[model samples]
Target: AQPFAWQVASLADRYEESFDIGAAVEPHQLNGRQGKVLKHHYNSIVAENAMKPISLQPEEGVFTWDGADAIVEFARKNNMNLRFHTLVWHNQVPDWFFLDEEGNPMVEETNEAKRQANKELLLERLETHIKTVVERYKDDVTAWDVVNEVVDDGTPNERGLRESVWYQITGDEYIRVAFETARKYAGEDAKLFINDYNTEVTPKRDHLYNLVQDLLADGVPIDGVGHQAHIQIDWPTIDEIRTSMEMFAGLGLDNQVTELDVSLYGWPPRPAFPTYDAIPQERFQAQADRYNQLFELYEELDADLSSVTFWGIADNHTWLDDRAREYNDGVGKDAPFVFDPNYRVKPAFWRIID
Candidate 1:
């Protein structure tokens, strides 16, 4: 904590007239130096993992508000806005969610009985989950990533939706119903969003664009689209990011650059050079320029955007390490945040400010 990140220009203030700039902050950091840095520089808070479905309601009919409530109070005390990470998703959900009557794992491959009974049962569970979670923080949270990663990458799946248990059981009704239930309980104060990654990719955004169009025409009360802008030093050009947002803005839905982080590795290949301190200066500067370009694009399209959030607060705890683990684990370390591992702002921060 000696790094003292609070002694710098405020990112929230830099973009005060445009949109709120927030980071994925956690409750544990609230009383420490990290909290000091957060309150000084940012005006918005989203619990890194505490607000997910598993964390909130791991068991049926049971609710734990310890972490969620703490973050809510922190936001209230700090005078910061709130963006609820998600209310529905495939991963980190309870195993019981995928079980059917007689407690069988409900995999929908060629099973004759894809059980209407199970669908109704699951929808009731979904509605209950959304209602309890959304209603509790409806007063404090201004926006909700109402559903997360519902669409598939490109193909080998349903028309637009990915084949998670939620999708298999209820098809797209789960997404439609989740938004409907969110709107019902989250109230007008909350702006509901369906969030997904790879929005800059063509086939992916095309499907998302069509799905949002259909959802709107069908009178689903969707308020925004969330691009989980988990980018890298390469891949998915700046033009693609702009086109993706414009793709949604034409549908009259607001957009948010949710979960933004620029990974040092592109395509998650084995590091050509190495990771950590072995990373040359040029790569770091390249990462800085990437952030500056993205922020400049955000400033240009501020009219269609609502808020911009980084996936993590600093390089010390970035999720990209886990993403790297998906390929080659130990060799692929990435420092992908505005601040370095010691809570010191990096060139990335300065580039964005400029």
Candidate 2:
């Protein structure tokens, strides 16, 4: 999707915005012709086969969906408007879902057999993989990142919010049974997020907003709250990402910005290129002035903020160039996205399209 992609595709385009199609979309590169004009220029579209052909089983089972059902049949013949790019997280899990073909204890079916028959065989294979991909794209998804990056807020593995085999077999009530199995296969106005990353700030945004306001005050069946704005250029700033998006819009719910990016670079504390490579011709005007100073504080925030999704779109498909080549730390070669690795367009992609 074009118009600098971040939601706003009204067509007759000089540029407005639009892009979702997640999970690093690559179903045979969407079968050509500029992926059918990027499948009718996005509005929402995230079916990378809900994270892999390996649907967590006899340790990340062999559940292959022909490379994400060819990007969900090219976003259902280009009608577009999906978003199921996840189910659980802890990174592309597939080292054989933490072992157990006699590899013992996938967390002993819940720390010492609290008896859940291996946690209802992983919740009947995650509610039959979310009712077979939300009842086979129940008329074009709508939303569903169900659960991902389960609250690690401060990155501290070895137990204490890090040991995820779905938190060692259904611990934190498997995130309210993954938002009650995605609101029983996405009903009542679809939507059902929980994505994560940097949590904007403070004890990871008040421990993921009081763990989804105590799982919606114990009713669960959560509704929305993604915010994977995975920042790392200058560590959580923008007044702590505008007070954690106004404290998750004062926890009312529905507030996505799922998987954003802005890794501007130029560390001066050291290594301006100590060895291998050095290229930095004002690295695209310092990452287009850091995406124009974070969209000038994200167009003076409003709060109920809906979407923004931009985990990759240039910067040469960056994951911060493998974190600056594994801590080679010079923070040198990085255009950090706005486009420009031959896809062209940059001036922070027209200062994010004016």
Candidate 3:
């Protein structure tokens, strides 16, 4: 058999002493060439969506485990460490979670007593859901993105908190309650993380720092932070990323690049979604160089970093490309993965190990 290209240098082994090299995976990507690329390159697995609240328990008290279970089984069989993608997020939550027992929207209630009742009910639901999910996978899953994207991209007057169901009902206490609950259920061995995107940007970065700082000060049991490192060819220099990591480290916390992918174009004409065509050779080289620079930075901060997880296994399977079609009405092809659509290693793949 021909030696696999990724065998040139196993990212998992190369970074083993510092952190587990990881990737985000959907259930379908666990087969064929996609699965092959994943096994060769990554030693840690995070479910791209299967472990989220929508998939895990779509309706209150109604559990769905097949999707999450399959990913867990794959990780265990492959000897890859697993991280639960998320326990709480403003998006992808079921409608029923925000409704009163009478099936009315909680936000519509004007009666103070009913509002208080609704708040208490929502808190109970949050606690039950966290405990159930964490305890089920605690032994195998080493970490949890306990709460994700709680910080808003809006101004400080907004207090950087996304005004979601959790916040509307529980206020800032929701953040503390989540970390406290996750700690209770995830146990001592499992690390808990609060993750968000655009954290490399200044306003959000400063806000996230304050948020985590306050969490720590209040004795919230947060263990680390996840920078969702989704990038385009332009913007967010390597220095910015390193500085963000160092800031989290300054809090005496470990950090991970949770969902990383680089777009060849900026937002607008191309947007950041899938463009279903081959990248030009020169552009591919630029992609390779960017990947190389980022990897070098990751290597330099081994102590502060815990992992670097790509958002997909191969170019054909990236979620960004898929969403481009759904959300942006995007067309054409994108080459964002380390491996090409045919599952052959791309220039970026070589850059990862070089």
Task: Give each model's whole-structure lDDT.
Answer: 0.85, 0.60, 0.82
lDDT of 2 by residue, 1-354 (tens): 333332333221322232233323556556443353354333444543345324422244345666556666777787655566687666665554444446566665444554466666666666666666566565666677788778775746422265577766667776787678778766778878887777776676777787788888999877777777766456667788778777767777766676676665433222334322354556556666666676667655634555555665445455656666556643434455555554445666666556
Q: Candidate 1, which ten residues in sequence have the lowest lDDT sum?
A: 268-277
The whole-model C-alpha lDDT of candidate 3 against the native structure comes to 0.82
The local lDDT score (0 to 100) that residue 271 gets in candidate 2 is 36
lDDT of 3 by residue, 212-301 (tens): 898798788889999889887656898899899999999899898888888776654255333445446788889889989988889899
Q: TM-score for all predictions?
A: 0.94, 0.31, 0.94
lDDT of 1 by residue, 1-354 (tens): 324467787889999888998888777878776777788888887888999999998888788889999999999999988999888989978888778767887664345555777787788888999998887899999889998998898675646678888877788999999999999997776799999999999688888988899889999999999999988876689899999999899888999988998888777555633456777878889998988999999999999997998887877787888767667845467788888877888888889987
- By lDDT, is 1 or 2 better? 1
Displacement of the residue 42 alpha carbon in candidate 1, Å: 0.9
Worst 10 residues of 2 by lDDT: 10-19
Clashing residue pairs found in predicted model 2: 53-63, 57-61
- Candidate 1 lDDT at 156 equals 59
Q: Model 1, which residues run further than 4 Å from truth? A: 1-4, 108-114, 272-275
lDDT of 2 at 346: 60
